[PDB]
Amino acid sequence: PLMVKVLDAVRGSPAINVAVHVFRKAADDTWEPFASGKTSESGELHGLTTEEEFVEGIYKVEIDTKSYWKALGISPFHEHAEVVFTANDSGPRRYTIAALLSPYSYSTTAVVTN
Amino acid sequence: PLMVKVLDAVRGSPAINVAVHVFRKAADDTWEPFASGKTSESGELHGLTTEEEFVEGIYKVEIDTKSYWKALGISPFHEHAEVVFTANDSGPRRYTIAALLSPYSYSTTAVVTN
Amino acid sequence: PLMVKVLDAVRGSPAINVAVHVFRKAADDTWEPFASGKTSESGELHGLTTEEEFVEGIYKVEIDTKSYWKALGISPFHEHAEVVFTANDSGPRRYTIAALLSPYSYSTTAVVTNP
Amino acid sequence: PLMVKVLDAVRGSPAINVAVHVFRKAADDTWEPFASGKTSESGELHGLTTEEEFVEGIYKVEIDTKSYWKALGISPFHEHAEVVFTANDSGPRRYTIAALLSPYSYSTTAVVTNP
Ligand SMILES: Oc1c(Br)cc(-c2nc3ccccc3o2)cc1Br
Ligand SMILES: Oc1c(Br)cc(-c2nc3ccccc3o2)cc1Br
């Protein structure tokens, strides 16, 4: 139900081997680790969770953009990119969180489908 | 070698049934029709061309954003969105032109892979 | 030395009355409140800090996009937009944090100048 | 009534000395030159037109992004960024066309105000 895709606006390519961490907001308002992985050669990270585990709640997707740029020898602005959203069962069932990265900028969108 | 994908930033969805026209620049600098189609339910338009036909050159991808917004009952800013680029054989072989649409804004990127 | 500008990609307008909260990472790795305000009729928020107060550190600029969209009677995707960055680590700079908002998307950029 | 602002997402800076050409669609459906200029050290291009001259029409703002990137010694994807829109069809408005540039991507937005 959740896929993350990361793209590079400098090289015009998928952003490969980017660390991504997903958190769920707990009842005490702390962020609890939920899922993580590294983007593939296509810039995508599949298999983070299952329908059963991905209950309604507030989730945070943290993308380690700083390490990505540093590996390329480029000095970046942001410590990371954070995407925070509510999963809602009323809405469609599959969520794609996409991020387009530049050293001093990023764009993110959600594609939510049934 | 060429795919076009269009996304909607207002609804968080693929932009479905969007007309897309591709042109190649001719030797007299006019734009000659090359390929066209309508995005699918996934927001993607596949099958525009073949490796044989897609020779080095300057290409224009025109996306009929105004009709898309009007069909949704939303007043848009742009007449259309234009993406103009050189296809170069030195670079990687497959080109994805992606566009993220809002009524008064759009973002575009190229994902170019081998 | 810190300005925040917010635009609305649906209306083609400044995003007015957007709440913005800035935090600085403390010695104990917690986010300490640093400054806050609301965007003006131009979509800009000036006067958050001074060059004396805006020392080296890791800062988080949280833009309350959800509250913005709800109030235009609209249900958006994100809770907020957060921008996290190290500032002033090579001496004082001036920072503009710009954000362009849609209900299911935002884009952010920084303009960093040396006075 | 027409301003163009261009930012650089690689450098985190205004995009300076970017050439901008504006066209208006003529009665015969050709693009007629309307105005042109270069962005300043702030990334802004003011003074393109007057409210008298900037009548109703379909306008194209062409931003010469390729020439910008080449000159920073860099090979970019797009030939230019073009923004095409109807203007002043409900009377005079003020238009800001903003563009945020990367070598393989750009984003553009409009801010339209009623004076
Ligand atoms: O499967 C995808 C998805 Br999901 C998002 C994008 C995408 N996300 C974007 C954000 C700003 C500009 C262009 C963008 O393209 C591209 C491809 Br290909
Ligand atoms: O005075 C401006 C204007 Br107009 C637009 C922008 C701007 N345009 C943007 C497009 C995408 C992401 C961030 C953006 O910021 C910034 C400033 Br500062």
Q: Is D90 annotated as a binding residue?
A: no
DSSP string, D51-79: TTT--SEEEEEEE-HHHHHHHTT---SEE
Q: Which two tokens stand for residue B114?
A: 């081998």
For tokens 């950029």, what's the residue? C109
Question: Does the beta-carbon distance from A109 to C105 stay under 8 Å?
Answer: yes
Answer for the pair A49, A21: CB distance below 8 angstroms, yes or no.
no
Q: List B102's β-bridge partners, or say none.
A: B105
Helix (H) or strand (E) holding D23: strand D19-25
Answer for the pair D1, D94: CB distance below 8 angstroms, yes or no.
yes
- Chain C residues inside the 8 Å CB shell of A23: none
Interface contact D107, partner B, CB < 8 A: yes
Query: Rounded CA gap, A14 and D108, in Å?
Result: 22
Query: Rounded CA gap, D89 and D59, in Å?
Result: 12
Strands (DSSP E) along chain B, which ranges? 2-8, 13-14, 19-25, 31-38, 44-45, 57-63, 78-87, 94-102, 105-113
Q: How would you class B90 by CB atoms within 10 Å of its CB: exposed for 0-12, middle for 13-18, buried for 19 or more?
A: exposed
Query: Rounded CA gap, A52 and A47, in Å?
Result: 13
Distances (CA, A) of A3 to A80, A95, A110, B9, B15: 18, 6, 10, 17, 19
Question: Does the beta-carbon distance from D9 to C113 stay under 8 Å?
Answer: no
Ligand 1 atom closest to the CA of B106, numbered from 1: 12
Q: Which two tokens stand for residue C82?
A: 């957060």
Could you state, in order of their start, the residue ranges of all structural domains in chain B?
1-114
Residue D66 main-chain phi, psi, to 5 deg: -65, -45
- Find which of D62, D79, D100 to mutate to test the B interface (most B CBs within 10 Å of its CB): D79
Convert C17-27 to b/e letters by CB count within 10 Å (16 or more is b): ebbbbbbbbee
Q: Which chains touch C (3 or more CB pairs under 8 A)?
A: A, B, D
Query: Rounded CA gap, A22 and A95, in Å?
Result: 13
Q: How would you class B91 by CB atoms within 10 Å of its CB: exposed for 0-12, middle for 13-18, buried for 19 or more?
A: middle
Ligand 1 pocket by Cβ (under 6 Å): A 5, 7, 96, 98, 100, 107, 109, 111; B 5, 7, 96, 98, 100, 107-109, 111
Answer for the pair D31, D19: CB distance below 8 angstroms, yes or no.
no
For ligand 2, atom 5, name the residue with the nearest CA. D98
Please name the fold of domain B1-114.
Immunoglobulin-like (2.60.40)
Q: List D96's β-bridge partners, or say none.
A: D3, D111
Query: Rounded CA gap, D31 and D33, in Å?
Result: 7
Sorted by sequence, the CB contacts under 8 Å of residue C53 that are 6+ apart come out as none
Closest CA to B5 of B23, B27, B20: B20
Query: Rounded CA gap, C108 and D10, in Å?
Result: 13
Interface contact C10, partner D, CB < 8 A: no
Number of C-beta neighbours around residue D47 at 10 A: 10
Answer for the pair B103, B74: CB distance below 8 angstroms, yes or no.
yes
**According to the entry, how was the structure determined?**
X-ray
Q: In this structure, are strands A94-102 and A2-8 parallel, antiparallel, or unpaired?
A: parallel
Q: In this structure, is the dihedral angle defined by the CA atoms of residues B100, B76, C6 and D108, taken in order, positive or negative?
A: positive
Q: In this structure, are strands A13-14 and B105-113 parallel, antiparallel, or unpaired?
A: unpaired
Query: Rounded CA gap, A80 and A77, in Å?
Result: 9
Output DSSP code: residue B46.
Answer: -
| For the CA of D113, the nearest ligand | 2
Closest CA to C4 of C34, C31, C40: C40
Question: Does the beta-carbon distance from C111 to D9 stay under 8 Å?
Answer: no
Residue C4 C-alpha to ligand 1 middle, in angstroms? Answer: 26
For tokens 């305000």, what's the residue? C37
Query: Rounded CA gap, B104 and D66, in Å?
Result: 24
Resolution of this deposited model, Å: 1.5
Answer for the pair A97, A83: CB distance below 8 angstroms, yes or no.
yes
Question: Mutation test of ligand 2: which of D109, D111, D112 has the most ligand atoms closer than 8 Å to its C-beta?
Answer: D109
Number of C-beta neighbours around residue B97 at 10 A: 23
Answer for the pair B89, B56: CB distance below 8 angstroms, yes or no.
yes
Alpha helical stretches, state H, chain C = 65-71
Q: In this structure, are strands D2-8 and D94-102 parallel, antiparallel, or unpaired?
A: parallel
The CA radius of gyration of chain A, in Å to the nearest whole number, is 14
Q: Is D70 annotated as a binding residue?
A: no
Question: Does the beta-carbon distance from D100 to C107 stay under 8 Å?
Answer: yes
Question: Mutation test of ligand 1: which of D105, D106, D108 has the most ligand atoms closer than 8 Å to its C-beta?
Answer: D105
For tokens 């995407």, what's the residue? A83
Closest chain B residue to C103 measured between Cα atoms? B10
- Architecture label for domain D1-115: Sandwich (2.60)
Query: Rounded CA gap, B5 and B16, in Å?
Result: 10
Distances (CA, A) of D38 to A8, A50, D5, D17, D77: 28, 53, 10, 5, 21
